[PDB]
Amino acid sequence: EVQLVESGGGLVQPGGSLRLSCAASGFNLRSYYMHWVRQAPGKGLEWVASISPYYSYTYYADSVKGRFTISADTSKNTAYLQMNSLRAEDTAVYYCARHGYGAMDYWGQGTLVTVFNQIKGPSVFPLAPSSKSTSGGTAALGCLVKDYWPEPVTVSWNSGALTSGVHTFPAVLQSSGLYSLSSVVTVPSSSLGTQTYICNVNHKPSNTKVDKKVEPKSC
Amino acid sequence: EVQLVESGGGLVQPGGSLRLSCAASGFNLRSYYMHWVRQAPGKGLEWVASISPYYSYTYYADSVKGRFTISADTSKNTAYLQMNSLRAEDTAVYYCARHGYGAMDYWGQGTLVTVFNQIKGPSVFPLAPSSKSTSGGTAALGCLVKDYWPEPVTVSWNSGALTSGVHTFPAVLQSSGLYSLSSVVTVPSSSLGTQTYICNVNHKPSNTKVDKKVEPKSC
Amino acid sequence: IQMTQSPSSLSASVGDRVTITCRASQSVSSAVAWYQQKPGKAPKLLIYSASSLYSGVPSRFSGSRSGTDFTLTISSLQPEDFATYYCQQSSYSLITFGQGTKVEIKRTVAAPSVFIFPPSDEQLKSGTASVVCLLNNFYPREAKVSWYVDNALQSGNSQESVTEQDSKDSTYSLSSTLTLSKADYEKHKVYACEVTQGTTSVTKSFNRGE
Amino acid sequence: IQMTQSPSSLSASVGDRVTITCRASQSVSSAVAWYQQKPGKAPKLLIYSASSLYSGVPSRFSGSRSGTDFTLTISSLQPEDFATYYCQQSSYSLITFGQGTKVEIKRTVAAPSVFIFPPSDEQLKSGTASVVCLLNNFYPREAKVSWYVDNALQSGNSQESVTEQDSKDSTYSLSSTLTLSKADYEKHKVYACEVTQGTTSVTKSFNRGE
Numbered sequence: 033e034v035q036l037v038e039s040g041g042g043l044v045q046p047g048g049s050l051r052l053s054c055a056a057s058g059f060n061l062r063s064y065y066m067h068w069v070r071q072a073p074g075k076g077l078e079w080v081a082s083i084s085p086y087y088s089y090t091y092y093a094d095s096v097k098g099r100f101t102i103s104a105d106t107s108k109n110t111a112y113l114q115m116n117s118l119r120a121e122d123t124a125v126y127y128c129a130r131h132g133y134g135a136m137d138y139w140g141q142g143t144l145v146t147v148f149n150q151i152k153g154p155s156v157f158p159l160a161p162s163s164k165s166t167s168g169g170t171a172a173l174g175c176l177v178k179d180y181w182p183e184p185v186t187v188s189w190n191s192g193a194l195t196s197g198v199h200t201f202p203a204v205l206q207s208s209g210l211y212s213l214s215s216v217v218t219v220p221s222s223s224l225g226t227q228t229y230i231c232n233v234n235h236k237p238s239n240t241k242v243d244k245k246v247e248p249k250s251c
Numbered sequence: 252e253v254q255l256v257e258s259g260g261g262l263v264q265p266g267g268s269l270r271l272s273c274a275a276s277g278f279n280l281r282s283y284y285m286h287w288v289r290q291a292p293g294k295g296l297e298w299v300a301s302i303s304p305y306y307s308y309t310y311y312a313d314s315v316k317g318r319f320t321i322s323a324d325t326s327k328n329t330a331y332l333q334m335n336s337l338r339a340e341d342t343a344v345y346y347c348a349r350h351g352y353g354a355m356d357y358w359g360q361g362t363l364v365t366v367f368n369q370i371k372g373p374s375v376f377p378l379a380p381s382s383k384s385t386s387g388g389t390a391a392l393g394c395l396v397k398d399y400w401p402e403p404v405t406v407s408w409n410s411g412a413l414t415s416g417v418h419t420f421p422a423v424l425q426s427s428g429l430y431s432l433s434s435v436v437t438v439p440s441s442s443l444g445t446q447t448y449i450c451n452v453n454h455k456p457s458n459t460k461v462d463k464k465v466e467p468k469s470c
Numbered sequence: 471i472q473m474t475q476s477p478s479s480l481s482a483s484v485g486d487r488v489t490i491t492c493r494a495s496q497s498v499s500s501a502v503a504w505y506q507q508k509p510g511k512a513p514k515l516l517i518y519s520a521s522s523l524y525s526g527v528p529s530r531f532s533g534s535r536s537g538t539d540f541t542l543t544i545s546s547l548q549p550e551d552f553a554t555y556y557c558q559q560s561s562y563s564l565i566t567f568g569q570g571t572k573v574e575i576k577r578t579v580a581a582p583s584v585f586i587f588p589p590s591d592e593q594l595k596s597g598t599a600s601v602v603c604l605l606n607n608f609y610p611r612e613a614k615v616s617w618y619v620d621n622a623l624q625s626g627n628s629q630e631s632v633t634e635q636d637s638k639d640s641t642y643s644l645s646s647t648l649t650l651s652k653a654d655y656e657k658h659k660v661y662a663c664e665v666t667q668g669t670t671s672v673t674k675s676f677n678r679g680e
Numbered sequence: 681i682q683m684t685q686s687p688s689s690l691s692a693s694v695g696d697r698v699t700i701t702c703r704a705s706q707s708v709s710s711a712v713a714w715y716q717q718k719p720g721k722a723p724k725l726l727i728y729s730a731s732s733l734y735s736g737v738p739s740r741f742s743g744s745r746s747g748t749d750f751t752l753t754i755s756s757l758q759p760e761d762f763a764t765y766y767c768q769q770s771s772y773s774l775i776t777f778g779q780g781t782k783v784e785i786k787r788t789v790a791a792p793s794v795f796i797f798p799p800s801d802e803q804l805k806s807g808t809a810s811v812v813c814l815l816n817n818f819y820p821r822e823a824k825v826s827w828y829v830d831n832a833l834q835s836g837n838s839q840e841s842v843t844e845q846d847s848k849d850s851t852y853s854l855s856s857t858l859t860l861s862k863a864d865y866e867k868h869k870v871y872a873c874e875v876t877q878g879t880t881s882v883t884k885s886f887n888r889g890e
Contacts, residue, residue, distance in 0.1 A: 040267075040270075042264070042267060050259075051270050134501045135518040136513070139514075157802055164886075172793070174814070176810060199846075201855045203841075204839045213841065216855070218816060250801070295779055352734070353728055354729075355715075355768075361722060376590040384674065384676065391606065395593075395647075420632070433602060435645070
C-alpha cells in the first residue's frame with residue numbers, strides 16, 4: 033500500500049539547520065511530483081516546495097526561497113528538504129505529499145519542526161568602582177552582562193587595548209532561561225579619575241554591540 | 252587560511268535523526284582523509300567515523316556502527332555525518348578534523364548534539380466505578396495514564412472490542428514535564444458485576460504495553 | 471494568486487446543506503482541489519479539478535465553479551463531517567491554499583453526566599493523588615468546572631482535557647484532573663466537583679472513607 | 681586497541697618536568713599523536729609519529745616511545761600549559777584516543793582581593809537587584825562565599841562563576857552574584873559578602889545609602 037513516512041524533525045535555534053526525509057513506500061518517487069506542505073500550530077496549510085519527477089526541477093515559495101532546498105534520492109525513494117536560516121515562522125508541522133489528479137492524493141503523518149526561544153540581546157550594567165571597597169592601589173571595576181540569549185557574547189575593554197587584569201567570567205544560566213556574566217579588571221586606584229574605561233560587549237546572534245563606560249558611583 | 256566550520260547540531264529525542272556538515276575552506280576536501288570526533292560533556296575524545304579522499308571509503312566505530320553514516324560532497328567541499336537511532340550516549344560536542352602527518356592537523360569549532368529527556372513508560376491507575384457516583388443505568392469507568400514521555404500512547408478497551416462509549420482524552424503536559432491522560436467508557440450499571448473491563452494502553456516509544464482491569468472500588 | 475476562503479467557521483446541524491466558497495484572486499483554470507482535515511490527522515483529498523470526486527469520498531461532497539468562484543457543497547451534513555476544510559490552487563506552479571473553514575455541528579443543548587473518582591489506592595502509595603471529574607456527552611462545549619476540598623475552592627492545581635466532537639451525537643466530553651500530594655489528600659474529608667452551564671449547576675462529591 | 685593513559689590528573693609547578701605516559705594494549709606502530717585542549721576550545725596537535733613536533737609547538741613538548749609505552753614530556757612547565765592532554769592512536773584504521781590527563785599548575789597559596797558591588801541605579805529601575813562579590817587572584821580554587829543581608833544568611837538566591845587558571849600567575853578568580861527584587865533590596869540596609877579559605881575569613885560590606 034502507498035505509504036509516506038517522515039522524520040528528521042526537531043527543535044533548533046533561530047538560524048540552525050535541519051533536513052527532513054520523505055520515505056516513500058508503495059510507489060516510485062521518481063515517477064511523481066512531490067510536495068512539502070507545512071501547517072503552523074493553529075494556522076492553515078502552507079505550500080513549501082515541490083520537485084519534478086525526473087527533470088529534478090525544484091519549485092519553492094517566497095517564504096522559504098533562498099533558505100530551504102528540496103531534493104530527492106531515487107535510489108532510496110526518499111525526498112528531502114534542507115531547511116536553513118530557520119526563523120520563528122518556520123515552527124510548523126511539515127507534511128510530504130504525492131501529486132496526482134492535479135492535487136495531493138497521498139499524505140504523510142507529519143514531523144514537527146520547532147524554533148528555539150527567541151534571541152535576546154544583553155543588558156550591560158556598570159560594576160561601579162569606589163574607594164572604600166578598594167585596596168590602596170588595586171582598584172576593581174567591571175560590567176555585568178545580564179539576560180541574554182543565546183550564547184556567546186564577546187566582552188573587550190577599551191576597544192581591546194586593556195587586557196592586563198581583565199577577567200571575563202563564564203556565563204551562568206539564570207532561572208529565567210537567560211544567560212548572565214560579568215567581566216572585571218583591576219586598575220590603579222589613581223587612574224580611576226583619569227583613564228576612561230569602556231566594556232565592549234558584542235552579541236553576534238542579536239547583531240548587537242553595547243559599549244558601556246564604567247565610572248565612579250554616586251552618593 | 253585553512254578553516255573548518257560545523258553546523259546542523261541541535262536537540263533531538265532518542266531515535267530521531269540529524270545530519271551535521273563540515274564546511275571546509277582553504278583546502279580541497281577530496282584530497283584529504285576527514286574524521287568526525289566527539290567529546291561527551293565532561294568526558295574524553297571519541298572517534299566517530301572517517302572518510303577516504305577519493306575512494307570514498309567509510310570507516311566507523313562500533314559505538315555508532317549501523318546507526319551513523321558518513322558522507323562527503325566534493326562539489327561543496329563539505330563532509331557530512333547522518334546520525335540516526337540517536338541514544339543518550341550520543342549527547343556530545345561533535346568536531347570534524349582533517350587528517351595529516353598521521354594525525355588530525357586542523358580542527359573545527361564543534362557543534363552540540365543533545366538527546367532529549369529520557370523516555371518514560373506510562374503509569375495506569377483504575378478510575379474505579381461505583382454505585383452512588385453512578386446514574387441509574389449509566390455507569391462510568393476508566394483508566395488514568397499518568398507520567399509518560401514522549402507521545403503518543405494508544406488506549407484500547409477489551410482488546411478493541413469495547414468501542415461504544417469510549418472517550419480517550421487528549422494528553423496534558425503536567426508541570427513535571429511528563430504527559431498524562433485518561434480514557435473512560437460508559438457501561439450499563441448491571442454489567443459492572445459481570446462484564447470484565449480491561450484498558451489496553453500501549454507506549455511504542457518505551458516498547459511497553461499495560462493492560463489494567465478496572466474493577467469496583469473497596470470500602 | 472490568492473484564494474480567499476469564506477467563511478472562516480460555521481455551525482450547521484445534521485442534514486443542513488453546507489456551502490463553502492473559495493474566491494480566486496485571478497482566473498487560473500479549474501485546478502482547484504478540496505480537502506478535509508480533522509485534528510491531529512493529515513488532510514484528506516475530497517475533490518479535484520473542482521468538480522470530480524476523489525475515489526471513496528461520499529456523494530454528499532461536491533465541487534462547483536463560476537468563473538473565479540469555487541464552491542464546496544456538503545448536501546446532507548453528517549456528524550462525522552466536522553473538520554477544517556481547505557481549498558487549494560495548483561496553477562502556475564504556485565500551489566496556494568485557502569485560509570480554511572472550520573465546520574462544527576450544531577445540536578440540541580445537552581447537560582453532562584457528571585462523575586467523580588477518588589484517587590486509586592495504588593497512586594496513593596506513590597505519594598500523589600489524582601481526583602478526576604468527568605463531564606460526559608454535553609453540548610455546547612463551554613462549561614465551568616470548579617474544585618472544592620472541605621468547601622475550600624481550589625485553584626491552580628487542576629488540568630482539563632476535552633475530546634473532539636463525538637462523531638455520532640455531536641456532543642463533547644471533558645475531564646478535570648485534580649492533583650494533590652498524599653499528605654494533602656489524607657488531610658481532608660470531602661471532595662466536590664462543581665460544573666456550571668448557563669443557569670444550571672451540578673455538584674457531585676465523595677467523602678474520604680465512605 | 682586500547683590506549684591506557686596515565687595519570688588521569690596532575691598538579692606540577694612552573695619549571696617542573698611533566699611526564700604523561702600512554703601505554704598501548706598492542707604493539708601498533710609509532711602512529712601515536714599528542715594533543716592539548718583547553719576548556720571550550722578544539723584540541724591542538726602537539727606531536728605526531730610519537731616523536732616529531734608539529735609546526736609551531738614550543739620545544740618544551742616532546743614525545744617518546746619504548747615498545748608499547750609512549751611518553752609526552754613537558755620539560756619546563758609554563759603556566760599556559762594548563763590543559764587536558766590526550767594520546768591518540770591512528771593504526772589499523774581504528775583511531776583510538778586515550779582517557780586523558782588534566783594538567784593543573786601548582787602555586788604558592790594566595791588570598792583573594794575581595795570586592796563588593798551594589799546594584800547599579802539602572803538595574804534597580806527594572807526591578808531586579810544584582811549584588812556581585814569578586815574574589816580576585818587566589819589559590820587554591822576552593823573557597824566558601826556566603827551572603828548576608830542585615831545579618832540574615834542568604835541561601836538559594838546566588839550564582840557563582842570562576843575563571844580558568846590564569847595563564848600567568850596560575851591563580852583563580854571567582855564571582856558570586858546575588859539576585860533580588862527591587863522591593864527586597866530597598867527593604868534592607870547592610871549587605872555583606874563573606875569569603876572563607878582555610879583558617880581565614882574576610883567579610884566586605886556596604887550600607888545602602890552611604
